Amino acid sequence: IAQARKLVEQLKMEANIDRIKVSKAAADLMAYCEAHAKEDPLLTPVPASENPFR
Amino acid sequence: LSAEERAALERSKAIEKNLKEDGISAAKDVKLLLLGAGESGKSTIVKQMKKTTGIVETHFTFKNLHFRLFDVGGQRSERKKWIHCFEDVTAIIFCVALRMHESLMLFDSICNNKFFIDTSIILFLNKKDLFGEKIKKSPLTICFPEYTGPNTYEDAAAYIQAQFESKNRSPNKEIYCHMTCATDTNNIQVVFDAVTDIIIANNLRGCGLY
Amino acid sequence: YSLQVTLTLVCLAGLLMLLTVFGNVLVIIAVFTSRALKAPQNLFLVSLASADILVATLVIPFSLANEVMGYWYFGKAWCEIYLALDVLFCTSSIVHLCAISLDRYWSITQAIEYNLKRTPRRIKAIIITVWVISAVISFPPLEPRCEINDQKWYVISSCIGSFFAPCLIMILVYVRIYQIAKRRTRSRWRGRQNREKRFTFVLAVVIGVFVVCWFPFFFTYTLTAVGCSVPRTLFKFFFWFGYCNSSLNPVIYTIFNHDFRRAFKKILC
Amino acid sequence: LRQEAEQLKNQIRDARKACADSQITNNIDPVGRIQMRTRRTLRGHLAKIYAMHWGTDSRLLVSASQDGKLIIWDSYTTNKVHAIPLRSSWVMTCAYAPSGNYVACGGLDNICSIYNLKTREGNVRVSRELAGHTGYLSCCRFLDDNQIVTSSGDTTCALWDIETGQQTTTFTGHTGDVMSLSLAPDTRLFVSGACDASAKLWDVREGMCRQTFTGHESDINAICFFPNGNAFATGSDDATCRLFDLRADQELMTYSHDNIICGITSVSFSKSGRLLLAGYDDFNCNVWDALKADRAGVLAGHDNRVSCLGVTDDGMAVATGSWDSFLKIWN
Amino acid sequence: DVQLVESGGGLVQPGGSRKLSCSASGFAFSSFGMHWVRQAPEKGLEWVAYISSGSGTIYYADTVKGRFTISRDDPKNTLFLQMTSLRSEDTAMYYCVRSIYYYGSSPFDFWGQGTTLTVSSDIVMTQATSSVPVTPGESVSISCRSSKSLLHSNGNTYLYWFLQRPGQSPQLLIYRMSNLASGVPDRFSGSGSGTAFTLTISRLEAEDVGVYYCMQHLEYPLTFGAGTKLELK
Ligand SMILES: Cc1cccc([C@H](C)c2c[nH]cn2)c1C
């Protein structure tokens, strides 16, 4: 009784979703990662100088 | 190479020395973990020693060996996740008594694991007088197949001990046993003997020569 | 004289020295930087390997230079020193083997009280003590044909101190351990019998390589010293046998430890 | 009326299935051969370690081990700033305050302990002993200097107040052991793991879960938020990392490989969200691409298994540490 | 809180002997490096001696070697300094100062009360002028001329400032010439270059008047500047 009364009310909140399209979601993800790829050093190794670790 | 990180580094060395001293002092004792299943089990053993909802550690003292005993009794959560941390522990304790014998398969489950294998098990049968007074009467049954043995008493006890055992599928395991009546002080002594035996076995396995 | 074969002799001696130094540096590197291996026990093995390195890198060159030309090309200095170093290092090796075996026996027997005292302090003290005693044994008497000393008082005492006591101590200790192991190990019996035979074999080989290598030369050296002098040419072979054992010894201890062997496997590949 | 639940479930199944239509941006260049090397060897611990965290300075990292000691290292010079002796030896998590003044840890003691750093006496000491849970703790995070968020083994997650010392709210509904709760960069939402292959986002103010994601076969063990604060990836004992997006409400990229047969212990993203780091229950630290779906990055060593790994806020370096009591810094 | 009470001084004839005891309470003294600093009865500051937290490292000033010795005992929470063969120049009042060294540390944070004592190369910094008339509500600037650049390869600038209240024990303002000490209003702000050092005070009030000092920590021995005194004309 209680479990169903709670689950039914909970499920409608998750049902109330847009949903945003996966194509544009993936496009946003690739755009963001490409835009921010110029900062992290693991992609392109930085020079040995200015490196805190020798 | 600069004034003050010279002091910082010597502070670091002092910290390291203190840490190593504390570690070499702490690793000197021995650790046994007991996880009695069901009920009417480990309570008698823990009572035989001479802020809730958590594991309780009991510290013991016997012949210059103080023991750190951990019983995960209040842990209502699943075993697989928190069960593993006890990995480097010398001996386990197993208590059972006396139908509802899923503890039989639970023993097999704990004795067979991807890790934790190379550890001896000290199982206790803490309820013996109750079993005896139950077996003078004929329940009988025995609710086992093809028992085909004498009813009373040592014969039935030995058949039970042969059961609930022999599931050791690995070498270099020394499964122990005892007959506790919940009224004797010999439990500490036999535990000490088992610990001493497993230490000797271990040492012999170390070069080894085993 | 071996006018032509000296090339083969020097080649084999260099091969022996490189093999022993390789094995010893390998075992030292393995014992360092290994958390499981980290234990007070291994310090004796470290000291033994170090003494084995030093003896190989010092004595073998000069002994090789001897007996291939027939002339002591160097001066009177420093042959005395040389002999002292040679006896010191041999005795070191022997008594480190003695100490490691004694420590194991001490650990196996009377386990409840013993595990208490294995503190790097005590073990480092024992290492100091063994180095001192070796130095004390080696201290006296401190064309040219500078050959091994033959003082009657020195020869017998040095021989007994270098050989007889450690050998009997090893024999007694390992017989005791074998008896205890057999007694304790009175459907996976496949199994118990196989484990029994295996540990019997490993104890046999450990106690046997040492004796078969060191007994011949010391036996002959004890002979012709105060007793009847009946030496022969194979004395040179007997001499070399000691360096062969020095090369040999490190492996016979590293092979029979599963975690030690795993560390060796990791470091090699 | 329980059948209505399983019909609604088919409704939402068709919904998610229709809202999606791998074959996109596949032409981008591969990350290529990626190799990291050890630069430091933090060798102070004695026993196995479980968790570590990075400070906001990207300088001091704290790790916990079975010996019961917390160490604040100096990653630059491999020093030891502090060594806290614990009350309960058994610990499974640790956390660093964003302000750098407090450090918290917890384990099987079922109580979260919070410590203080800056004081007149110049010695660390306890501040509060949070005792509301009845199960083993999994992880702790700091929303700010005044609020903590934690996840225990009671299938429940609770938000506390250190000065108050009481559970201001409680979240529940996973019906399984919840592990590895990771806060989002926005510090207003978070997603927690579960023992039943389910992940749920939660609201830090309203108090009820917003979405519930599924699709995996076995227990999960790790989760972390994407730098953009709009996605996350979860690791599991099925040797599989699955990426979920709240907007998509469906799995995006199933990372898998036939050769690997093992579990997962910890994951962490990169600064730009292109390197997907992970720590397996094996003798390596497998590294995967963000969305290109190729097993590219491999890290050798160390001897034992791998428990935790954490990337710095700036991305200069990464840290590791596992049951062998050694910590390595890979750059 | 933290209290440093010292009383071991007295009028001693030249060539005599005396001992100094600085009692520490309110903090873990066993984990701190301890400093001795004396001030002349008329003007001037100088460093006497320093002892490490672990007592494994000792230092002394140029005119202290062979005459004065230092020693501390952790269980007693007190520092022992022995005055032997005291000279006519030694007539000055002293100060015992605590310190600590690790990453992001603030040494010389708290200063003692001091004792009254009477009788009968290395980089040096200069401050000029030593007296400037100021008014409340007006910002002021202080500079300390240094000899050698103090910017170490670690990216740091080993320099510290201090402020002595008129008749009271001095206390710290800026550490590492860039940060702010605890219990200090945000108006103060250190500054300067690698060799040139500047102190900035904004919205000066009538309770901050005193004497300023500059001090370096790049290399032993230490040294102190001439100092600058303000007024409320
Ligand atoms: C007494 C003594 C000490 C050291 C060495 C030896 C023998 C002759 C030897 C030489 N070279 C390697 N072994 C003896 C006899």
**In the 3-class helix/strand/coil scheme, how is B31-80 assigned residue by residue?**
EEEECCCCCCCHHHHHHCCCCCCCCEEEECCECCECEEEEECCCCCCCHH
Residue D91 to residues B99, C162, D48, D64, D164, Cα–Cα distance (Å): 38, 54, 11, 7, 24
- Cα–Cα distance measured from residue E141 to residue D210, given in angstroms and rounded to the nearest whole number: 57
Cα C158 to averaged position of ligand 1 atoms, centre (Å): 10
D299 contact residues in A (CB cutoff 8 A): none
In chain D, domain spans: 1-330
Q: How far is the CA of C70 from the centre of ligand 1 (A)?
A: 19
Does the annotation list B52 as a binding residue?
yes
Alpha carbon distance B198, B63 (integer Å)? 17
For ligand 1, atom 5, which residue shows the shortest CA distance? Answer: C87
At residue C45, what are phi and psi to the nearest 5 degrees? -65, -40
Element (H, E) at E151: none
SS3 assignment, position B155: helix
**Domain residue limits, chain E:** 1-120, 121-226
The rounded distance, in Å, linking the Cα atoms of E189 and B1 is: 29
User: What's the Cα-to-Cα distance from D270 to each of D267, D315, E231, rounded to whole Å?
Assistant: 10, 7, 57
Q: Which of these, E16, E216, E6, E7, lies nearest to E110 by C-alpha position?
A: E6
Q: Which amino acid is at D127?
A: S
Nearest residue to D201 (alpha-carbon basis) of D217, D216, D223 = D223
Asked if the C-beta of C202 comes within 8 angstroms of chain B's C-beta atoms, the answer is yes
Is the separation of the CB atoms in B163 and B147 below 8 Å? no
Residue B129 is assigned to a ligand binding site: yes
C242 lines ligand 1 (CB under 6 A): yes
C155 CA: nearest ligand 1 atom: 1
- The residue count for chain E: 233
- What is the whole-number distance in angstroms between the Cα of residue C86 and the centre of ligand 1? 6
Chains E and C share 3 or more Cβ pairs within 8 Å: no
Residue nearest to atom 8 of ligand 1 (CA): C239
User: How many whole angstroms separate alpha carbon C133 and alpha carbon C136?
Assistant: 5
Task: Judge whether E31 is closer than 8 Å to chain D, CB to CB.
Answer: yes
The one-letter code for the residue type at C168 is L
What strand order describes the sheet that includes B91-96?
Answer: B56-59, B67-71, B30-34, B91-96, B120-125
Radius of gyration of chain B (CA): 22
- CA proximity to C63, closest of C222, C216, C241, C250: C241
- Our answer on whether the CB atom of C162 is closer than 6 Å to any ligand 1 atom is yes
Q: Which residue has the tokens 């600038």?
A: E157
Nearest Cα to C86, choosing from C59, C67, C48? Answer: C59
* C50 alpha carbon – ligand 1 mean position (Å): 18
Query: Which residue(s) pair with D235 in the sheet?
Result: D222, D241
Closest residue on chain B to C255 (Cα): B207
Q: Among E27, E102, E103, whose Cβ lies nearest the Cβ of D121?
A: E27
Question: How many domains in chain A?
Answer: 1
Q: Residue type for E89, please?
A: E
Q: What is the resolution of this structure in A?
A: 3.6
Q: Determine whether the interchain pair D315/A42 forms a contact, defined as Cβ–Cβ distance below 8 Å.
A: yes
Contact C33, D302 (CB under 8 A): no
Tokens of E57: 């490292």
Q: Which member of C41, C111, C198 has the closest CB to residue B200? A: C111
**Is B136 a known ligand-binding residue?**
no
B43 is in an annotated binding site: yes
Q: Give yes or no for B163 touching C (CB within 8 A).
A: no
Residue entry with tokens 């270099």:
B172
**Which two tokens mark D80?**
């030891």
Chain D residues with beta carbon closer than 8 angstroms to that of A11: 5, 8-9, 12
Q: For residues D80 and D66, what is the distance between their CA atoms, to the nearest angstrom?
A: 18
> Cβ contacts of residue E109 below 8 Å, gap of 6+?
E98, E99, E172, E181, E182
Beta bridge partners of D84: D70
Distance, in Å, from the CA atom of D277 to the CA atom of E21, rounded to the nearest integer, reads: 58
Instruction: In whole angstroms, give the CA distance from residue D104 to residue D139.
Output: 10
**Closest to E160 measured CA to CA, from E225, E214, E210:** E214
In the β-sheet with D220-225, what is the strand arrangement from edge to edge? D220-225, D232-236, D241-245, D250-255
Task: Select from E74, E99, E103 the residue whose CB has the most chain D CBs within 10 Å, as the one to mutate to test that interface.
Answer: E103
Distance from CA of A49 to the nearest CA of D (A): 13
- Give C88 Cα–ligand 1 centroid separation in angstroms: 9
Written as six digits, the tokens of B53 are 């909802």
Distance separating alpha carbons of residues C153 and C159, to the nearest angstrom: 10
**Do residues E174 and E191 lie in contact, with contact meaning Cβ atoms separated by under 8 Å?**
no
Q: What is the 3-state secondary structure (H, E, C) of E96-160?
A: EEEECCCCCCCCCCCECCCCCCCECCCCCCECCCCEEECCCCCCEEEEEECCCCCECCCCCECEE
Q: How far is CA C263 from CA C33, C184, C259, D90, in A?
A: 10, 30, 6, 29
Partner E, chain D 57-116, Cβ-Cβ below 8 Å:
59-60, 74, 79, 81
Give the residue among B30, B31, B32, B36 at the shortest CA–CA distance from B123: B36
Q: Is B61 annotated as a binding residue?
A: no
- The answer to whether E229 touches B13, Cβ cutoff 8 Å, is no
Residue B48, both tokens: 């035989």
The structural domains of chain B, with segments of one domain joined by +, span 29-205
**How far from chain centre, in Å, is Cα B124?**
9
E184-212 burial string, b = 16+ CB within 10 Å, else e? beeebbbebeeeebebbbeebeeebbbbb
Please say whether the beta carbons of E9 and E41 come within 8 A.
no
Minimum Cα–Cα distance from E100: chain D residue: D122
B60: which residues sit within 8 A by CB, 6+ positions away?
B49, B66, B67, B68, B69, B188
CA gap C229, C180 in Å, rounded: 43
Please tell me whether residue B89 adopts helix, strand or coil conformation.
Answer: coil
Q: Which residue of B has its CA nearest to C253?
A: B207
Whose tokens are 């003294």? That residue is E29
Q: Locate tokens 């400032």: which residue?
A: E161
Q: What is the CATH number of domain D1-330?
A: 2.130.10.10
Q: Please name the member of D67, D110, D177 whose beta carbon is closest to the beta carbon of B53.
A: D110
Determine whether the shortest distance from the Cβ of C87 to ligand 1 is under 6 A: yes
In eight-state DSSP terms, residue E177 is: T
Q: Which chains have at least 3 CB atom pairs separated by less than 8 Å from chain E?
A: B, D
Distances (CA, A) of A19 to A10, A24, D201, D216, D245: 18, 11, 16, 21, 11
- Give the structural domain span for A50: 1-54
Both tokens assigned to C50? 């170090």
Q: Ligand 1: does its nearest atom lie under 6 Å from the Cβ of C148?
A: yes
**Residue whose pair of structure tokens reads 């009254």 in the numeric block:** E116
Helices (H), chain A: 2-15, 22-36
Burial class of residue C229 (count of CB atoms within 10 Å of its CB; 0-12, 13-18, 19+): exposed
Do D324 and C266 lie within an 8 Å CB cutoff? Answer: no
CA separation, residue B122 to residues B29, B95, B202, D155 (Å): 18, 8, 16, 33
Select from C31, C83, C73, C28 the least CA-distant residue to C51.
C28
Helices H / strands E in chain D, number of each: 1, 27
Option in C107, C199, C256 nearest B203 (CB): C107
Query: CA-CA distance, E49 to E34, in Å (whole number)?
Result: 9
Q: Which candidate, D237, E29, C206, places its Cα nearest to that of B80?
A: D237
Total CB pairs under 8 A between chain A and D:
114
Cβ pair D273, A36 in contact under 8 A? yes
CB atoms closer than 10 angstroms to residue D64 = 29
Backbone Cα Rg of chain D: 20
- Local structure of residue B86 (DSSP, 8 states): G
- CATH of segment(s) B29-205: 3.40.50.300
Which of C111, C253, C258 lies nearest to residue B203, judging by beta carbons? C111
